[PDB]
Amino acid sequence: HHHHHHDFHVEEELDWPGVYLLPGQVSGVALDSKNNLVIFHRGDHVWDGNSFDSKFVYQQRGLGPIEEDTILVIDPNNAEILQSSGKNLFYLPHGLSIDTDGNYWVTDVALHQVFKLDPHSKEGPLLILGRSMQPGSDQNHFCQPTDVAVEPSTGAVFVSDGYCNSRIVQFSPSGKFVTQWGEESSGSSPRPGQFSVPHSLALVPHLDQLCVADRENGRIQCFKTDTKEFVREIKHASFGRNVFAISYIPGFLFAVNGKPYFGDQEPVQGFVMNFSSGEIIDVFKPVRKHFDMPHDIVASEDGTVYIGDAHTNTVWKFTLTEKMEHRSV
């Protein structure tokens, strides 16, 4: 604020070779305890108009599951693939997050399910939530579930359930339904506690909060994690129509929006917000390749930010910095 604008800026790390990877649609990103990037991709499977019918049931079961490894851990420096798994399990990968023990938490929009996986196991999922290929809206069904966040202090499993639902569901560490909140965003304006496609979750550990990217409303909703009380709404004209994904590190909320329609004024970008005020302090995009559907984002306390694209099938590494003078502008 000494010069006209703001001093924090996010910039692509150009010496990171992970941009040269050729995965399928990249649906989820996360960081493991060694700060390695972990991605969740769709191989040769694509989400299109012939994937689901009118009742949200998956059409291409006979093509089988994705045959190639679907989860990759990627070195933060040389971008080499350190390990891979997720072979012969998934149909349309979506969310990926990692709990405090290092377990993977994954969602599938075709299966309508949520998986807990031990990364160092050879004997299949530790937990499966929801019913295979069966979309629903009760305590034991999902409808195209989008993301999962697991609270390190309680072990509470939160699932954002809604490309066709409008809820967040709490589960016990043993997979048992605890509680749920949220409903479809009502007539005229959308009111607090109402989702239209809860698409991304970020926990705020020491403020006991949970943040939700409401993609169709173009906004973020924050809730108190114990009481479920609506804390706050973040909405900016810069987002445009969508907020696809969010990530928290102390001090900052990071977000990606959606691609503009023809005529739209708001480009596709990463966003950096001051977490307290909720205000956008920085806007960014890659130098190599381009955003089309940036779909998930994960930030590290060390200042690293990763983004995966579900259309250009790419992951980028970025770095948050504060500089005395702005190299650009």
Ligand SMILES: [Ca+2]
């Ligand atoms: Ca994620």
Ligand SMILES: [Fe+3]
């Ligand atoms: Fe300044």
Ligand SMILES: [Zn+2]
């Ligand atoms: Zn999605």
